[PDB]
PDB file of C-alpha atoms in Angstrom:
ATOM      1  CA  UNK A   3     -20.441  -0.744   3.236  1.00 36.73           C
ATOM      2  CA  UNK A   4     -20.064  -4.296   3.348  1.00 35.77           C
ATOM      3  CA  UNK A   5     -17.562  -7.365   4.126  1.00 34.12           C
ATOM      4  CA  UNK A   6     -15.840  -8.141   1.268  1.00 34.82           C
ATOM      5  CA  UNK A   7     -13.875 -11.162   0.371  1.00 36.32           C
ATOM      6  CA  UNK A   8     -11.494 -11.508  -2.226  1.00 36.13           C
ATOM      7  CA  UNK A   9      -8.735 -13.655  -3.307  1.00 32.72           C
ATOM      8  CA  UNK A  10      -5.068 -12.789  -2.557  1.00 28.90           C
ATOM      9  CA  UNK A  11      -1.895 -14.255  -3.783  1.00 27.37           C
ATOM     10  CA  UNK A  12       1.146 -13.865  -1.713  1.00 27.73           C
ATOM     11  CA  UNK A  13       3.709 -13.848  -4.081  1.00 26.28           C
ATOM     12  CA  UNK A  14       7.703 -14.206  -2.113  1.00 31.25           C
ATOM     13  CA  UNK A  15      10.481 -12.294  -3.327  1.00 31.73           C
ATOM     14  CA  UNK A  16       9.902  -9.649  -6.016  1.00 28.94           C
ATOM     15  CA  UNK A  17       7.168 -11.100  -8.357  1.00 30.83           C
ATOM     16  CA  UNK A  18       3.963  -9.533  -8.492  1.00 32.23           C
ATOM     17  CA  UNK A  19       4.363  -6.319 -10.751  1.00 30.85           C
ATOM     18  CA  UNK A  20       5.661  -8.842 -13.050  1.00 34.04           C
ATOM     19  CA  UNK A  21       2.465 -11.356 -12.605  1.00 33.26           C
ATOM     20  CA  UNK A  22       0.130  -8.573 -12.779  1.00 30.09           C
ATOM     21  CA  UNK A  23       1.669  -7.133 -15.852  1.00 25.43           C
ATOM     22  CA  UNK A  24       1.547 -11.028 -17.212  1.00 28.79           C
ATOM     23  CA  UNK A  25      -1.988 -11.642 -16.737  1.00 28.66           C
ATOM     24  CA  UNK A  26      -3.201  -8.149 -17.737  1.00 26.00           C
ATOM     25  CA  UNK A  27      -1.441  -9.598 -21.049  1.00 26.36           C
ATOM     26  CA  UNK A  28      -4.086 -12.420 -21.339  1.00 28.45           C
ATOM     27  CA  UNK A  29      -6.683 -11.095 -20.495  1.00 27.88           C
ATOM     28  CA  UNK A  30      -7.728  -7.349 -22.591  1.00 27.39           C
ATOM     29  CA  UNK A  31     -10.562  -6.157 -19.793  1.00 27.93           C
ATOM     30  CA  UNK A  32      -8.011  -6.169 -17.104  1.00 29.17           C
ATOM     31  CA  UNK A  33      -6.307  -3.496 -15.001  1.00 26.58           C
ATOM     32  CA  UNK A  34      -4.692  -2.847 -11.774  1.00 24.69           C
ATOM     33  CA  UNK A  35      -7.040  -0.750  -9.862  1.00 25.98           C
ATOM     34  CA  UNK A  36      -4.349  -0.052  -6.838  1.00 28.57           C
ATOM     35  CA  UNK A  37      -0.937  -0.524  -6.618  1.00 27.37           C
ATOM     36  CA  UNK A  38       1.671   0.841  -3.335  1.00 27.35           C
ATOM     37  CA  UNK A  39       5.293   0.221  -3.514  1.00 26.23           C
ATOM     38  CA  UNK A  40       7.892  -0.246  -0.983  1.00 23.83           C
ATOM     39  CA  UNK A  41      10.471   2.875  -0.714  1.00 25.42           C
ATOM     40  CA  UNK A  42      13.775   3.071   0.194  1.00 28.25           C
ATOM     41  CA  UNK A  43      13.359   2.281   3.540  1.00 26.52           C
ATOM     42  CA  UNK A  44      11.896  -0.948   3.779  1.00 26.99           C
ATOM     43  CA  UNK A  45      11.324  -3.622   4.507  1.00 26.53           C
ATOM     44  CA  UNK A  46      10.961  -4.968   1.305  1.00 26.62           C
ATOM     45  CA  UNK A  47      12.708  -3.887  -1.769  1.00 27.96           C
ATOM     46  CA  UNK A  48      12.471  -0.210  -3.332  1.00 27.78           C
ATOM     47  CA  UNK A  49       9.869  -0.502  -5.759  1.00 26.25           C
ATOM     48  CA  UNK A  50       8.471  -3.944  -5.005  1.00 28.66           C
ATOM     49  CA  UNK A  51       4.663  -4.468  -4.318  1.00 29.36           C
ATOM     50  CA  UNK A  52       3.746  -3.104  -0.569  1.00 32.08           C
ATOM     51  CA  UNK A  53       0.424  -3.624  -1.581  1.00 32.96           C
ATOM     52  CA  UNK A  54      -1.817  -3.997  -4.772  1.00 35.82           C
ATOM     53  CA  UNK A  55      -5.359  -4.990  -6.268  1.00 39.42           C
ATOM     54  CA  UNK A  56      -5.829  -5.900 -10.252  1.00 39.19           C
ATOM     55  CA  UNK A  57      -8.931  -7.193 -12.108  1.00 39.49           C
ATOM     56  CA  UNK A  58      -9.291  -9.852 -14.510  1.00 38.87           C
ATOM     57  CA  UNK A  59     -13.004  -9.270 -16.417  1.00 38.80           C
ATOM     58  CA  UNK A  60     -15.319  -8.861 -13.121  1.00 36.66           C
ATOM     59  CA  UNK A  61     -12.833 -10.535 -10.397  1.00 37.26           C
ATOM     60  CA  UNK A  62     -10.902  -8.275  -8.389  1.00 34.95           C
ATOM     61  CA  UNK A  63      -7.316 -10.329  -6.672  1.00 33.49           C
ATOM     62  CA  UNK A  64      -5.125  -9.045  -3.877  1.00 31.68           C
ATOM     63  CA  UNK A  65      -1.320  -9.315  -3.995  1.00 28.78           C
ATOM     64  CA  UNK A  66       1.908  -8.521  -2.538  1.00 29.03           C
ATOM     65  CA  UNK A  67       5.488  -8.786  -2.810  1.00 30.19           C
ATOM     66  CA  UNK A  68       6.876 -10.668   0.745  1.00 30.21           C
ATOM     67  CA  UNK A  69      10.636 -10.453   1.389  1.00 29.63           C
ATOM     68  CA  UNK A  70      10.092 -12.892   3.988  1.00 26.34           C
ATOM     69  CA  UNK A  71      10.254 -16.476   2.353  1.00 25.22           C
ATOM     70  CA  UNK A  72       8.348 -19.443   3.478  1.00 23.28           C
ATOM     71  CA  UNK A  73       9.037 -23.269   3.119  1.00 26.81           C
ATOM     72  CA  UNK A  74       5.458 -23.262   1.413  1.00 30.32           C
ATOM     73  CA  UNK A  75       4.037 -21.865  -2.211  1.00 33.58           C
ATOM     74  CA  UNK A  76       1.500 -21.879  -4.175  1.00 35.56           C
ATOM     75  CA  UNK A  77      -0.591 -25.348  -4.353  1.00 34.68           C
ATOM     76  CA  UNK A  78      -3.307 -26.816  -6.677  1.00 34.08           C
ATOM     77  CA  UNK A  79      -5.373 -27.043  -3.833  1.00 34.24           C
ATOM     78  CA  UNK A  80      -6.134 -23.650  -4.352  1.00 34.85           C
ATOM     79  CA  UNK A  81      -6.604 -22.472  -7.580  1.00 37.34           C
ATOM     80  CA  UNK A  82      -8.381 -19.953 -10.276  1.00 35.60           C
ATOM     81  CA  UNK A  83     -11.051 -21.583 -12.578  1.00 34.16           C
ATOM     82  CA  UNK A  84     -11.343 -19.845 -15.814  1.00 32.04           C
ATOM     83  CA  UNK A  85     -14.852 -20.261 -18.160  1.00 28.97           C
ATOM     84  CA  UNK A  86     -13.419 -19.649 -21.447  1.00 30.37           C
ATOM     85  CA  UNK A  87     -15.346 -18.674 -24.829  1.00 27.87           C
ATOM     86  CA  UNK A  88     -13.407 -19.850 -27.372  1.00 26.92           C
ATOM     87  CA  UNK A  89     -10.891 -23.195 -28.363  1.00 29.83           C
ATOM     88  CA  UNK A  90      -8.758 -20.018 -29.783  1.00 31.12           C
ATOM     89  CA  UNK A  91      -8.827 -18.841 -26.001  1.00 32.21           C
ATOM     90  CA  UNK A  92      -8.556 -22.152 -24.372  1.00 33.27           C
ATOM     91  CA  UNK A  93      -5.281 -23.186 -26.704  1.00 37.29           C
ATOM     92  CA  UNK A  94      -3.830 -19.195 -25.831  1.00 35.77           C
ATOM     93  CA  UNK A  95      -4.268 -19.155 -22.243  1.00 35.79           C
ATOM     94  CA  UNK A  96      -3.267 -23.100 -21.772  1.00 34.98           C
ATOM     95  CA  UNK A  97       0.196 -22.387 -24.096  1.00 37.86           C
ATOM     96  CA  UNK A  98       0.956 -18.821 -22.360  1.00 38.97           C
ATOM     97  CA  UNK A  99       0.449 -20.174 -18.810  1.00 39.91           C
ATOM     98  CA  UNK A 100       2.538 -23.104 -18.780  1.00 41.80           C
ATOM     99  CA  UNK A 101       5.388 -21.433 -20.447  1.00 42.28           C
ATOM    100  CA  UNK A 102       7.992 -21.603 -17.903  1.00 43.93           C
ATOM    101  CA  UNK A 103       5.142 -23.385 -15.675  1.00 42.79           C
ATOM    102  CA  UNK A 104       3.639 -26.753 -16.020  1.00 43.45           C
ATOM    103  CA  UNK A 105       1.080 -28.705 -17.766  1.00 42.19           C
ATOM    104  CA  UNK A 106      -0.114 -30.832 -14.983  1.00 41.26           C
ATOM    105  CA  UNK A 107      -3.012 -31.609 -16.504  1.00 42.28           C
ATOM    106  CA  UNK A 108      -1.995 -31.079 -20.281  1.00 42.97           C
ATOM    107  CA  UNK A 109      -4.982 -29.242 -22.277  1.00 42.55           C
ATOM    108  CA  UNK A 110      -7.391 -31.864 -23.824  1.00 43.63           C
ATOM    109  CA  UNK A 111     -10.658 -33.471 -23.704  1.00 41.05           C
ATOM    110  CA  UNK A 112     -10.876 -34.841 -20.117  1.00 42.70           C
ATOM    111  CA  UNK A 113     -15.095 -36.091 -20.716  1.00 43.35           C
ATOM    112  CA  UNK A 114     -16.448 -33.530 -18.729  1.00 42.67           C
ATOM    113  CA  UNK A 115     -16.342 -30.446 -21.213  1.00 43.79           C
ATOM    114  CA  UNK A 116     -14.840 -29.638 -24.806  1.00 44.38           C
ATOM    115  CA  UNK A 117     -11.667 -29.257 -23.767  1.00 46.61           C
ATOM    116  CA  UNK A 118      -9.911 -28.988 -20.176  1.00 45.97           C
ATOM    117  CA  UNK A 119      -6.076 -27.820 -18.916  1.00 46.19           C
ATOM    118  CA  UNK A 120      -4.586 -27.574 -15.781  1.00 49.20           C
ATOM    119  CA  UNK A 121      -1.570 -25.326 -15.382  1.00 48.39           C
ATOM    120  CA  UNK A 122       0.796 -23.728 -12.731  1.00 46.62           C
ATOM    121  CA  UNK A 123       2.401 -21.065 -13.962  1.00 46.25           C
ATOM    122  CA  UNK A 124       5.547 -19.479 -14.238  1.00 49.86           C
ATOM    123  CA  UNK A 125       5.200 -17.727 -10.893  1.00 48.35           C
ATOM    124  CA  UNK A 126       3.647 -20.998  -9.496  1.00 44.61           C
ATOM    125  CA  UNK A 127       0.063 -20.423  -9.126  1.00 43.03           C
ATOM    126  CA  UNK A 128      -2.619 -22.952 -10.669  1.00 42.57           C
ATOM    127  CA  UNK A 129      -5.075 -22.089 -13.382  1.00 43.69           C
ATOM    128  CA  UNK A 130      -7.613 -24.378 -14.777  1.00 39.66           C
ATOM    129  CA  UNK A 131      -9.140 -23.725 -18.153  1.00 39.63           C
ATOM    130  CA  UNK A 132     -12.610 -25.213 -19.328  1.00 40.55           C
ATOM    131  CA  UNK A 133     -14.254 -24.831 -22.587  1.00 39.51           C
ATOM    132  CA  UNK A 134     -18.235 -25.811 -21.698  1.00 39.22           C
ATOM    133  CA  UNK A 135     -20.145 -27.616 -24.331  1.00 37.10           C
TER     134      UNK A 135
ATOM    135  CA  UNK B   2      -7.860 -11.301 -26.086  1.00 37.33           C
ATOM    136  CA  UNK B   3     -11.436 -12.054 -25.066  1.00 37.48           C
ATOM    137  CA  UNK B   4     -13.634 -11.945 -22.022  1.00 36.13           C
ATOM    138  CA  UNK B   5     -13.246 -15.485 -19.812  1.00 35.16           C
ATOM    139  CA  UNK B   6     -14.827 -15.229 -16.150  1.00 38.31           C
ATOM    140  CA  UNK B   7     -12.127 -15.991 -13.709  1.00 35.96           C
ATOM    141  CA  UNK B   8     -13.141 -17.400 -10.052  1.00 37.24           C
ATOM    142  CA  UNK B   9     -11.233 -18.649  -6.973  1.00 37.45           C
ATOM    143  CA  UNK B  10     -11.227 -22.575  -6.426  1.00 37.47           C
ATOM    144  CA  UNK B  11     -11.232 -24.700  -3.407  1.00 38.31           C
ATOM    145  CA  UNK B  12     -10.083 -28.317  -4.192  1.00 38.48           C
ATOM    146  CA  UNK B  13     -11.093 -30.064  -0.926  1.00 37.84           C
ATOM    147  CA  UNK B  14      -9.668 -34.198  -0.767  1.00 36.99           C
ATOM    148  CA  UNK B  15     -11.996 -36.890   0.657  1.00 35.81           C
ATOM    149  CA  UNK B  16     -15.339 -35.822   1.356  1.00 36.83           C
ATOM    150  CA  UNK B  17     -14.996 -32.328   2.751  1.00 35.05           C
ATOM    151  CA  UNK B  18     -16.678 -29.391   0.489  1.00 39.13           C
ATOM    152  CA  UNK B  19     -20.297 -29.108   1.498  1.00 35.70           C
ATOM    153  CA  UNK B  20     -19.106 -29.213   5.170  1.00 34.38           C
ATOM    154  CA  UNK B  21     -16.872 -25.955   4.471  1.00 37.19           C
ATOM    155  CA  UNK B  22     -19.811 -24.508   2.305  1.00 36.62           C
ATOM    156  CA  UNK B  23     -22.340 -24.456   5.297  1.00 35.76           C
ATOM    157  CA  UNK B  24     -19.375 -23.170   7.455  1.00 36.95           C
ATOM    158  CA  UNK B  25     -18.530 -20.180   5.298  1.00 35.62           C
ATOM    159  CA  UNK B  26     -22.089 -19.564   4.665  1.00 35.80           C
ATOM    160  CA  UNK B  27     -22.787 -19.432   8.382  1.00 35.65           C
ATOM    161  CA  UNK B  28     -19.852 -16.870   9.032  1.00 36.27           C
ATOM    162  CA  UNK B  29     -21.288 -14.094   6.431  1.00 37.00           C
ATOM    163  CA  UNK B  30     -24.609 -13.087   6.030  1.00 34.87           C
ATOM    164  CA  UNK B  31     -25.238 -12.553   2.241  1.00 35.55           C
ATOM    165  CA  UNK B  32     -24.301 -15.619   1.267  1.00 35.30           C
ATOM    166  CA  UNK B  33     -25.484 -18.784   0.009  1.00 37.52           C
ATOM    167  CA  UNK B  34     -24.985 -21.645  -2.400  1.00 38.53           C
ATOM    168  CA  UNK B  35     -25.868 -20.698  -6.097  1.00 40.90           C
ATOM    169  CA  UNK B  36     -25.089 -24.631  -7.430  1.00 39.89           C
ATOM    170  CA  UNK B  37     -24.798 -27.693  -6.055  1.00 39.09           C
ATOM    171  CA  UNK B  38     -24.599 -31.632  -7.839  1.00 36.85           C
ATOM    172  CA  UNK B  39     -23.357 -34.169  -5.620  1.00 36.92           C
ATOM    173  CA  UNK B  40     -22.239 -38.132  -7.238  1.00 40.65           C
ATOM    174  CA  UNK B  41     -24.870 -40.514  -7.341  1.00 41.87           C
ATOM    175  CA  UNK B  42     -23.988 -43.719  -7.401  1.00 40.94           C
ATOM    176  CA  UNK B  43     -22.119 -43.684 -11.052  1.00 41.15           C
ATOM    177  CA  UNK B  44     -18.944 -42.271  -9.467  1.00 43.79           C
ATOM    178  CA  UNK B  45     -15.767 -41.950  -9.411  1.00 43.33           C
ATOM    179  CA  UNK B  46     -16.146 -40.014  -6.561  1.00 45.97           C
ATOM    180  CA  UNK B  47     -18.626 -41.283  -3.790  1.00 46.20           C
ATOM    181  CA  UNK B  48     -22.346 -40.670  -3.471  1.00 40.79           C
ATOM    182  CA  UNK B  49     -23.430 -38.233  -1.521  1.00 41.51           C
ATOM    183  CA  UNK B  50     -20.043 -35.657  -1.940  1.00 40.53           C
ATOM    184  CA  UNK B  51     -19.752 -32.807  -3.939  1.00 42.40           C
ATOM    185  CA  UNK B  52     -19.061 -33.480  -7.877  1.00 41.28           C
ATOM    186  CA  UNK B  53     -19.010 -29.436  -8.321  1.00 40.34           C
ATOM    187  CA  UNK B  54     -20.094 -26.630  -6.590  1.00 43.39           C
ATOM    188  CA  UNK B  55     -20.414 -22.890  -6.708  1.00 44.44           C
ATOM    189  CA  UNK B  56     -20.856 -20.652  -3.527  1.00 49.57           C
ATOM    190  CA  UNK B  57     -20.893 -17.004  -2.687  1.00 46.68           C
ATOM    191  CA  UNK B  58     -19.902 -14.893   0.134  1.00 48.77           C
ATOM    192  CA  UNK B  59     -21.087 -11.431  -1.007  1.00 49.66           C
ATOM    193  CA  UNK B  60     -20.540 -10.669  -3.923  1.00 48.92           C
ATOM    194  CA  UNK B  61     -17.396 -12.996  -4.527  1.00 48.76           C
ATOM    195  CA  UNK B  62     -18.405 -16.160  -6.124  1.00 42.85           C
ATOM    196  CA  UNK B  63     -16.118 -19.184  -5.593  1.00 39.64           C
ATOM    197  CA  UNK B  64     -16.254 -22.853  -7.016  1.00 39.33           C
ATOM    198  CA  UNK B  65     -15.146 -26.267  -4.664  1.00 39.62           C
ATOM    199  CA  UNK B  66     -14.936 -30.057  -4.887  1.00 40.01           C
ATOM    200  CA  UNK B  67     -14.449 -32.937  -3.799  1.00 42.03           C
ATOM    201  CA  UNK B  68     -11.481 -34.450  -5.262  1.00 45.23           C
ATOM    202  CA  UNK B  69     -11.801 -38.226  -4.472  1.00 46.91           C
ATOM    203  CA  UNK B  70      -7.989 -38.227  -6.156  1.00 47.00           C
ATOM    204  CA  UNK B  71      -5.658 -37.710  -2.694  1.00 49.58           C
ATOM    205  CA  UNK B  72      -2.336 -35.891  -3.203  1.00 51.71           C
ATOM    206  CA  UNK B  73       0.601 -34.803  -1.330  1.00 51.74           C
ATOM    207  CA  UNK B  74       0.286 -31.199  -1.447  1.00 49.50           C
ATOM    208  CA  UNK B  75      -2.398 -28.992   0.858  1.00 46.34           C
ATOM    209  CA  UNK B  76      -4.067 -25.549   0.743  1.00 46.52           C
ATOM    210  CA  UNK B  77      -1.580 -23.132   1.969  1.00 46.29           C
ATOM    211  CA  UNK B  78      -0.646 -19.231   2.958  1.00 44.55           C
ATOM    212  CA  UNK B  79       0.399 -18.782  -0.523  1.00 45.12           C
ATOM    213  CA  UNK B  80      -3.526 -18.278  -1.697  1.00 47.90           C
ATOM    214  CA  UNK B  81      -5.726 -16.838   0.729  1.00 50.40           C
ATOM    215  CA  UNK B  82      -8.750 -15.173   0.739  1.00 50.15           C
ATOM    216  CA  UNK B  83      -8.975 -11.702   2.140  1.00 52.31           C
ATOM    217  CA  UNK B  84     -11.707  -9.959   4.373  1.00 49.89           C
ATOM    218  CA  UNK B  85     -12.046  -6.233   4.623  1.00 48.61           C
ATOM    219  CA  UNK B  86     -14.343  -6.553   7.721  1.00 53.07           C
ATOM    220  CA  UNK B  87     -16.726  -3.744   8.710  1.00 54.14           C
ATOM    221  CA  UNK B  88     -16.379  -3.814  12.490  1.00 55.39           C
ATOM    222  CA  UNK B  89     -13.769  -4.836  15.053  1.00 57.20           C
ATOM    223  CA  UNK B  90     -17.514  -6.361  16.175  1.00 58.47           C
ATOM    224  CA  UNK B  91     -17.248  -8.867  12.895  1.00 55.92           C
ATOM    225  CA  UNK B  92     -13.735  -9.335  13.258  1.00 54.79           C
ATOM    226  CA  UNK B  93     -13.604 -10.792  16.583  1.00 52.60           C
ATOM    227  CA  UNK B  94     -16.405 -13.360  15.654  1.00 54.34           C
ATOM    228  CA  UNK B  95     -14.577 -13.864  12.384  1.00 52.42           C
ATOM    229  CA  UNK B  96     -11.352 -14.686  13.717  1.00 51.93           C
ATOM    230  CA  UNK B  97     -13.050 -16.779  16.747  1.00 50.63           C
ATOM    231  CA  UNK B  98     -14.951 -19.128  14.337  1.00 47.34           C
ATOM    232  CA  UNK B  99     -12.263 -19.555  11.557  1.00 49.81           C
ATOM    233  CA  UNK B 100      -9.191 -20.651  14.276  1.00 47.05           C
ATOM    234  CA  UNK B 101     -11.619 -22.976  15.760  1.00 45.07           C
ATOM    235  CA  UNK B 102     -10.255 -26.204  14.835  1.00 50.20           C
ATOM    236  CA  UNK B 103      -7.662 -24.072  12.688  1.00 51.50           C
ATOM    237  CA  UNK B 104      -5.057 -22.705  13.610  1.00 53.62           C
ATOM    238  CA  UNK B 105      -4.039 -18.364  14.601  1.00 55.90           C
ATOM    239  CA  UNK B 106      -1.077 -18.299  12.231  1.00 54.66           C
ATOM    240  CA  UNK B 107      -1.134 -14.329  13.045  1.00 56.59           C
ATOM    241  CA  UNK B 108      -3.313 -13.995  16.145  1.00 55.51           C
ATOM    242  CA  UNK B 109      -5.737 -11.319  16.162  1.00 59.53           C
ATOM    243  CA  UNK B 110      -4.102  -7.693  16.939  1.00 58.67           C
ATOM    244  CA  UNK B 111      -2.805  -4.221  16.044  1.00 61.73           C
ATOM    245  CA  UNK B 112       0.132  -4.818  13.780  1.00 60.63           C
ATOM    246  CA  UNK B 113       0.271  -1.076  12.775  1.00 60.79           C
ATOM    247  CA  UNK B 114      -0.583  -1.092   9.233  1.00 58.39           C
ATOM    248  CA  UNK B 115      -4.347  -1.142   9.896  1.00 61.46           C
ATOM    249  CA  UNK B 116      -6.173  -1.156  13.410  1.00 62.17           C
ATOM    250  CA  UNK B 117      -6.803  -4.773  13.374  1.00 64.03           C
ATOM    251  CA  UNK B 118      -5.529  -8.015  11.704  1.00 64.27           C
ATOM    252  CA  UNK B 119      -5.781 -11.548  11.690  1.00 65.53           C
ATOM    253  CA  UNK B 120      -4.130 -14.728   9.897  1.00 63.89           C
ATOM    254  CA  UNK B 121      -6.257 -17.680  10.115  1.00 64.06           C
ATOM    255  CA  UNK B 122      -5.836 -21.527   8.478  1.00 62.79           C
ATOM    256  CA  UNK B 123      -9.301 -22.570   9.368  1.00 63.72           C
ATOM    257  CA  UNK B 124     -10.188 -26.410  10.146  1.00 62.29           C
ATOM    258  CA  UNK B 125     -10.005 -27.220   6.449  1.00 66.91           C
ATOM    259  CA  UNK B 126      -6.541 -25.627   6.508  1.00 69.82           C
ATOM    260  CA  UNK B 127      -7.671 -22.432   4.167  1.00 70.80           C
ATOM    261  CA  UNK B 128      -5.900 -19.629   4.364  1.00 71.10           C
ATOM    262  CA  UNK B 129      -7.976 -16.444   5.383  1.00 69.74           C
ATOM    263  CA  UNK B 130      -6.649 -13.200   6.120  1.00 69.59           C
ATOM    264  CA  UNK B 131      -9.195 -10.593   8.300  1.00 71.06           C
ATOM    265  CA  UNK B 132      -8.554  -6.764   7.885  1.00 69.98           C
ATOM    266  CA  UNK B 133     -10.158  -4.239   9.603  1.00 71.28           C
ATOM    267  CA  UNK B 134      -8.987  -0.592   8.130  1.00 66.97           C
ATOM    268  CA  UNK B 135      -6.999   1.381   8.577  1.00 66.59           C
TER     269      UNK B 135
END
């Protein structure tokens, strides 16, 4: 079959059970489709995330837990865009994701859609919500 | 807690987007650019670069800019995208193209989990990982 290309968060220290089970909480079609867990010998912690793949809707997301730190984390330069249905959704997603994140750009009307929010989240990654007209 | 699609984004500063469009679409060969509107003259950003875009390589979709807005902060290994490639054929062009002008932050090779692997920051400094299974 062919190349495929997928996004993949590198999340350091022992994060990404907990960021998959947090997403799969805002989102209702949403699963982990594979998940492989360090044992207890190494290198990372027993039970952490070797390996793993979860879906949100139709996009599948690589992740793993590193036990190797790095001076560097997640940026806005790189980011997931979400197209959401509802101001309902929009207000959900924008309070749940900054909780113990930030608001960098707080949700509101920003004159290029209904409504607009830019958040990183708790575990540092940046989401941006849009509500087309 | 309803449906939403969710897509990867490339924030590219200055005037850089279209230029790493044409260069992804060149490494893969389903791919292409599904929409494209660049600034006229109305701004902010300047004519000619990308107001908002939306690419795909395969079947993964992914949106870009150009953010005339400069900040301090740059893509980095934290968000990546990953390539299960087909061939150690398509990996070794892969990992050729994307370190030229980038850099091999894991140079192609054998690092036992799978029987080839690469970790490239490409000229635009994004993050790609190549995979060839095992």
């Amino acid at each position: 079959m062919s190349a495929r290309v997928r996004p993949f968060l590198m999340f350091q220290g022992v994060q990404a059970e907990a960021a998959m089970n947090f997403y799969l909480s805002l989102f209702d079609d949403a699963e982990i489709l594979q998940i492989q867990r360090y044992g207890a010998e190494g290198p990372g912690p027993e039970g952490s995330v070797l390996k793993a793949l979860f879906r949100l809707g139709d996009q599948s997301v690589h992740c793993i837990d590193s036990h190797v730190r790095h001076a560097f984390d997640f940026t806005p330069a790189f980011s997931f865009f979400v197209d959401c249905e509802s101001n309902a959704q929009i207000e959900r997603l924008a309070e749940a994701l900054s909780d113990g994140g930030k608001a960098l750009m707080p949700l509101g009307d920003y004159g290029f859609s209904q409504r607009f929010a830019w958040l990183a989240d708790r575990f540092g990654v940046s989401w941006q919500l849009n509500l087309a007209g």
